[PDB]
Amino acid sequence: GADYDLKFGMVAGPSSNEYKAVEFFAKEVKEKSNGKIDVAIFPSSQLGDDRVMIKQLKDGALDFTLGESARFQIYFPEAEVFALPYMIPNFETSKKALLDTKFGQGLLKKIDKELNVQVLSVAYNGTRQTTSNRAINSIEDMKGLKLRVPNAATNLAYAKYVGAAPTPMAFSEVYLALQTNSVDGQENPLPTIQAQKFYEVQKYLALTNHILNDQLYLISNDTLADLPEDLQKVVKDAAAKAAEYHTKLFVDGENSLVEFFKSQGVTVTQPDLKPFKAALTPYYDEYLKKNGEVGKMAIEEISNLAKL
Ligand SMILES: CC(=O)N[C@H]1[C@H]([C@H](O)[C@H](O)CO)O[C@](O)(C(=O)O)C[C@@H]1O
């Protein structure tokens, strides 16, 4: 078969838009390399979660993974800006904030230099909404709600600041937790709610619109070093096409999925978001205290972009 047998790990499962785009990536790479590269895919946290996988890219033990810009906060806390709730208004602002600002370029350089990882392309992974086993009519209904979050500082802070009881748990554990009422809710973009069938086990959806997720196609520098230049170019080009498809999948899913969910019996609320935004405002201050002048710059540059 192939000269290069590469591995691509992800948290998302095999019915997800992420998996659809990663399968497209693997196909494009096999075709354009003339069969010289073959890509195996390990979804559903088969290799661990995304923190483990990012570490495996760093260590040269895994070739590819997906990760949010914001996830880099586990190494470079200033990256948290990408996840601060209600701070980034759309994908265009997120992508330009990473690629076209001095802050973002500085962060990409650190990732390459210190973590041994290159960003191949940037995709949209949806805006997070809140499912539950009780109606969320306003921020008041968050109070004491047992809200699963991923194992991520910003989602923990979101739950805390709205009044909820944050319960961190790996993605792979969520469906059972919802089904059994071990937690009262969780929070994820619409397409994820569909792919994991969380709508099967949650009677309610609230459009809290709280955190916008991007999605980085990541490659280990050890992988790039293992590939000849012309196959490096194949990989880079394929990642560019896959990200565009990935983003389209999420945009078209978001535009359609509330109606789908209603048709499956889900009750869909639209709480006033003004008090959600006000509740999180002070967490921006925590960010600024933790990250100093780099943090300040990040927020100014995003503000300027959002203004366009
Ligand atoms: C690239 C990646 O693995 N994204 C995953 C994210 C991030 O881990 C989290 O947003 C913190 O960055 O968590 C999920 O939304 C979740 O567990 O609910 C699953 C999703 O597949």
Q: Do strands 117-132 and 146-149 pair parallel, antiparallel, or not at all (unpaired)?
A: unpaired
Task: Give the largest CA-CA distance in the chain.
Answer: 59
**Tally of domains within the chain:** 1
- Asked if 67 contacts 54 with a C-beta cutoff of 8 angstroms, the reply is yes
Give the CA distances from residue 27 to residues 36, 42, 237, in Å, rounded to whole numbers and listed in that order: 12, 15, 12
Distance CA 191, CA 184 (A): 20
Helices vs strands, H then E, count in the chain:
10, 10
Residues 3, 42: contact at Cβ < 8 Å?
Answer: no
| Alpha carbon of 27 to ligand 1 centroid (Å) | 24
Long-range contact set of residues 106-113: C-beta below 8 Å, sequence gap at least 24: 106/294, 107/69, 107/72, 107/76, 107/78, 107/79, 110/75, 110/76, 111/72, 111/76, 112/221
Instruction: State whether residue 208 is helix, strand or coil.
Output: coil
Structural domain containing residue 21: 1-308
Alpha-carbon span 219 to 230, nearest angstrom: 16
CB of 171 closer than 6 A to ligand 1?
yes
Alpha-helix runs per DSSP H in 66-215: 91-99, 102-115, 153-162, 174-179, 190-195
Ligand 1 centre from 190 Cα, in Å? 13
Q: Closest Cα partner for 269 from 159, 175, 134?
A: 134
Q: Are 301 and 102 in contact (CB under 8 A)?
A: yes
278 Cβ contact list (under 8 Å, min separation 6):
none
Q: How far apart are CA 17 and CA 198, in angstroms?
A: 15
What's the CA-to-centroid distance between 287 and ligand 1, angstroms?
Answer: 20
> What does DSSP assign to residue 169?
-
The span from the CA of 139 to the CA of 145, in Å, is: 11
Closest ligand 1 atom to the C-alpha of 51? 8
* Nearest Cα to Cα of residue 70 among 118, 104, 44, 120: 104
- Burial class of 282 by CB neighbour count within 10 A (0 to 12, 13 to 18, 19+): exposed
Residue 152 CB less than 6 A away from ligand 1: yes
Ligand 1 centroid distance, CA of 222 (Å): 25
Distance 271 CA to ligand 1 centre (A): 24
Nearest CA to ligand 1 atom 6: 150
**Measuring CA to CA, which residue among 208, 116, 114, 99 is closest to residue 158?**
208
> Residues 164, 166, 171, CA angle at the centre, nearest 5°?
130
How many whole angstroms from 286 Cα to the centroid of ligand 1? 22
> Is the CB of residue 47 below 6 angstroms from any atom belonging to ligand 1?
no
Residues in CB range of 83: below 8 A, 6 or more apart: 68, 70, 73, 152, 154, 155, 211, 213
Q: What angle do CA 264, 42, 115 make, to 5 degrees?
A: 115
| Cα separation, 293 vs 109, whole angstroms | 18
- What is the CATH number for 248? 3.40.190.170
Report d(CA 176, CA 239) in Å as an integer. Answer: 33
Check if 80 has its Cβ closer than 6 Å to any atom of ligand 1: no
For ligand 1, is residue 214 a contact (CB within 6 Å)? no
Is 114:79 a contact under the CB 8 Å cutoff? no
- Resolution, rounded to a tenth of an Å? 1.6
